[PDB]
């Protein structure tokens with residue numbers, strides 16, 4: 001409770017495994033990433049699907 | 050970032066020295082003086 005100002009869905013929520021907010025979840029969903037080499041992907045390139 | 054030969058990985062939480070990538074920074078600490086690669 002902060003004054004009356006609703007500060008839900010702008011703060012981290014511990015239900016999600018990542019600590020991004022619901023607004024931040026929307027911001028990450030709308031910006032469609034290219035799925036670059038930040039994660040390892042040679043196993044995915046070898047595992048042709 | 051990738052597989053890290055050399056050093057080790059401790060569960061201690063020190064400030065970021067020489068940084069490896071994706072939130073991992075190495076150092077040259079005592080914890081037999083050697084190289085560690087912590088989070």
Ligand SMILES: *[C@@H]1O[C@H](CO)[C@@H](O)[C@H](O)[C@H]1NC(C)=O
Pocket residue numbers: 001002004005006007008009
């Ligand atoms: C907004 O925040 C207030 C703060 O107490 C909370 O009571 C309310 O349920 C919240 N509403 C939503 C939709 O999250």
